[PDB]
Subunit: 409 residues, 3 copies
């Protein structure tokens, strides 16, 4: 393409891409298990495990039903002592009564305190499992979420892909025959898709099939955009007419009707092949004859006076008035296409249309408030001991007096 | 456009939109933190905190790997008393033995009951944190979910937007230069997109970049749809041929090839500018000459006999038979286009094609079953006391008898 | 279409679809409740219930704000006994002191152990509720997730659909008038869409409106793809020019400009009707005249030499060289179109372009590691008893000696 001349004719070079053919996909199947198997203690976990299983059922039942509906497609000393003996009997009884109190404590601890602590401790294990199961489900939701949400034609996540290739993106590239450029484009446009082929509700299983495309590259084939704008010819304005997309290989030109192709930032990805032969008369408009080109005179039509590409603004500021905003100055033009630079202002006016230049805004962040947590309530150790020591001191005094009396007697 | 005549020619006025140019986007970066910082007690939370951190790692590792792979693009009284003294010794021993029982209780409570309650209480704090962390992750999943699921070109959520603008949609509108009409269209077609530029797994951080478009409006520019159907000319039928989309500004007309534009309910949003000049011969078909218009005679082709817009059905019921279903009656036509109203029936037949009119269905709801929960198990207070009172009553009787004997002696 | 001849001309039969008109949608509204009502005990659940409610507020506030911003659109014996009586007093005191120790135990259990167990048990109920509420929210996230994430034009999930029709997909089909074929296509292309009309943050309610399309079928109408490739005419090559998509009904042909239609694996779903009449000259190219067809000579253009459909590769291997890779052999051609079979190799070369045939890869799986859990810590029953029995044995010996002395006295 002879741009040195084509620019004066009125056609501005636009974006440059590449050319790829979608081809036929490869397939890999994964079984995703929603319910983990927890062995060991069962009585402490059954309560939370059952509620978790119910969550899984509520999610999968609608998938199983949809797949079935869709199945076709899928002296008086004696008197004095009498008093003594009665006193001893009273202490013999007091001891027995003390034991009744001790027995009451044993009963209360053994029957009301210990059983509660043991039942509660088992319940604590259950809650721990309920938390783990909930977190596991969430991990699945971020990977196979889209597949669970709708059974057919979902975008597959990056986590699902790393599962498929066992945490190895080197293997993904070489197995599929992708370069780093192809992987970017494939993820960018969502070209990796999956479907659910079957489910089994009671086991929590889904059979998820993922299709990975096999794009092929057409060597030395570049898709080139052309953007025509009006230009001034001896006092009035004209428009040059060309196909907006032309395919250039080496020395050959053809047209592409890219109405049914996927367009990414660097490549046009088409099914089959959309290149069609180009007539001689029009080839001259790109090769350097720069005549004919069906230039049309414009009288009663709206015709563009600017074009945008890669952040730049191109405009005809010779035929009409264009100005820079917030500097309050016009832009002159001495060529038919003037380039307006983005380091003068961010808002330009061309005719009656304002063109806004994008800009960078400052950074922000998302987080939870940091919250300090206090310690658990701690029960102190039992402090009795000195009292027990005294009881022993009181007791041997009793012992000492008895031996004392036996000696005198 | 001279619709008063164009209708008789055979072209039905279709939907009316507006015209906007996508322009160049502005950028804002946010750091999203997946792991909160919890200070204070550490031993009670480390267990659940660690499992949570593991959840975050499983989600981000596939993102870090993908971004690296993609990096290039990113008397015998004495005998009688001897018996008395022996009895006293037996009670002295019984007291000592009682203390052994009390010591056993102290040992059991202090060593097996208290330590368990304290360890369990700390575990309760841990579970509380595990729940909070799980809920926090879920909040993130509903806002930055799409970004975590696939690193490139995701739709950004409304929650992510309110984070970017600090819970203020007044600022979003004025900063970007949007009207309420532009915000609706931008959200409707998913024009706000983001990408992940980098991640750091161990801190749980992702660097998420969001691009907000700067749409510009072309003043007094209306995109008008035209819908041609067949009509009867002296016994046979013809079709008028016009571009389906024409751009009308004021007194100027141009064509738009909207095959690569985004179409919303009220506006057509195109990159650059797709308006092209229109020839005089065809302008007359819209201005009021209503001749030429390349009317073509149809002999061996399938040609539409109806058109739909905004819920209405337009049809040619003069050349062919059309009927209302569930009333079992034909519709006559006396004009070439008959309008069928939707308050007569919901299903119309035009030729061999059934046209279904939509209708409103009754309301439903989604909720959990409401479940009543009972009280916790409550351990009663210790009820001993009257027994202790009796022990004291028994004891002073012992006291009273001793003083009694000392008096007699 | 006379394919028996058209193939020799240079046009390959491509994919065959069907023809449907999108029509006008029906509407059904559901109220989705994010906060369940839990009756019964309140003090044990308020803490976790409140944190849950806060989660709901953080999710819905951005929805309420967006909808408001968008509102416009929405002898010395006496001496000897004196010693005896003193000994008895010492045991009377020892008993009283023992009671003080017992009272200390009662105090400690009643004040520091029991209150903690009771407060802790109530806290256990709270944690159980916090887990249930978290799981409930997740169930919602998998069904109405997309709607919460962005208020306008979201794809509705399969779980949301089963909610709308009360777990009955038989009713969905008959109510809407869908066949199993229509349901598949509707889900495949995401044609069921919803919007949020209003929310109420404090109750956790969202008003979600779902639109279900009413597709109509055009009887005996088949959309047929045609794929032209170059062919050799007496030493040089030519390309035949036809519209890529033609509509065949019975004996009638028309063209379809499917640039604005949705294409599924079996049907083309268009708004209104895009069929346009076809001229006689070109009809002959399909009916069997197989002349004219604007065959163009190609001199300086890139022209396709192969076409792909349903996994098959068609190519011109007469004019240019094509070979099978990994067998290292050429493919000869004796017809202008050679069919390359996929059971010989998976990679073919046609000219300079490699064509990759897809293949099946082995199965994988996703699951959590299975982890065995141990038992809870269990506190043993209190083992005192034999000691108590001995205390009773010691005591009646005391009893026996006292009665013994009373007899001698
Ligand atoms: C679980 O309950 C069963 C009774 O069904 C019992 O036999 C078993 O010992 C219990 N196991 C545990 C750890 O409590
Ligand atoms: C008091 O005597 C009891 C006898 O059962 C013994 O267990 C305890 O350790 C002694 N305490 C002191 C301080 O001597
Ligand atoms: C946590 O454990 C450390 C021992 O690593 C100990 O020194 C510290 O006191 C403990 N803190 C709490 C609240 O238990
Ligand atoms: C019984 O005597 C003990 C002595 O230790 C005292 O603590 C307790 O309160 C008294 N109880 C009654 C009812 O008098
Ligand atoms: C809850 O707390 C209130 C005091 O606000 C009290 O009256 C009520 O009895 C308590 N209920 C339970 C089950 O603890
Ligand atoms: C010992 O005597 C006490 C009296 O309070 C009684 O409760 C306990 O059961 C007796 N134990 C044995 C083994 O006789």
């Amino acid at each position: 393409l002879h741009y040195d001349s084509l620019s004066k004719v009125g056609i501005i070079k636009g974006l440059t891409y590449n050319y790829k053919i979608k081809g036929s996909p490869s397939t890999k199947l994964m079984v995703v298990k929603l319910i983990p198997n927890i062995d060991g203690v069962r009585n402490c976990t059954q309560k939370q495990f059952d509620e978790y299983k119910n969550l899984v059922k509520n999610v999968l039942e609608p998938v199983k039903l949809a797949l079935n509906a869709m199945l076709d497609n899928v002296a008086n000393m004696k008197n004095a002592i009498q008093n003594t003996n009665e006193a001893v009997k009273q202490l013999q009884l007091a001891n027995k009564q003390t034991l009744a109190v001790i027995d009451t404590i044993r009963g209360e601890i053994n029957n009301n305190i210990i059983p509660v602590i043991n039942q509660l401790s088992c319940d604590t294990i259950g809650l721990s499992v309920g938390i783990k199961l909930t977190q596991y489900y969430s991990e699945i939701l971020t990977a196979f979420g889209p597949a669970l949400q709708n059974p057919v034609n979902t975008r597959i996540t990056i986590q699902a892909i790393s599962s498929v290739f066992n945490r190895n993106f080197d293997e993904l590239l070489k197995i599929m025959g992708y370069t780093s450029g192809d992987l970017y484009e494939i993820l960018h446009s969502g070209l990796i898709r999956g479907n659910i082929i079957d489910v089994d509700v009671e086991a929590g299983y889904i059979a998820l099939e993922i299709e990975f495309p096999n794009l092929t590259l057409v060597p030395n084939a570049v898709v080139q955009e052309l953007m025509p704008i009006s230009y001034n010819v001896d006092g009035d304005e004209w428009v040059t007419l060309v196909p907006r997309f032309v395919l250039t290989r080496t020395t050959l030109l053809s047209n592409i009707d890219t109405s049914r192709c996927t367009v990414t930032e660097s490549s046009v990805i088409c099914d089959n092949d959309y290149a069609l032969p180009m007539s001689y008369e029009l080839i001259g408009c790109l090769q350097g004859d720069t005549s004919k080109c069906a230039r049309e005179k414009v009288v009663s039509s709206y015709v563009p006076r600017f074009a945008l590409s890669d952040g730049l603004v191109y405009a005809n500021c010779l035929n009409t008035i264009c100005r820079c905003m917030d500097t309050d100055t016009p832009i002159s033009q001495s060529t038919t296409v003037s380039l307006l630079d983005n380091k003068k202002c961010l808002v330009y006016q061309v005719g009656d249309i304002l063109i806004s230049v994008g800009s960078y805004l400052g950074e922000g962040e998302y987080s939870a408030d940091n919250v300090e947590l206090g310690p658990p309530v701690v029960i102190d150790k039992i402090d009795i001991g000195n009292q027990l020591a005294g009881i022993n001191q009181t007791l041997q005094n009793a012992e000492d007096y008895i031996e004392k009396s036996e000696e005198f007697l």
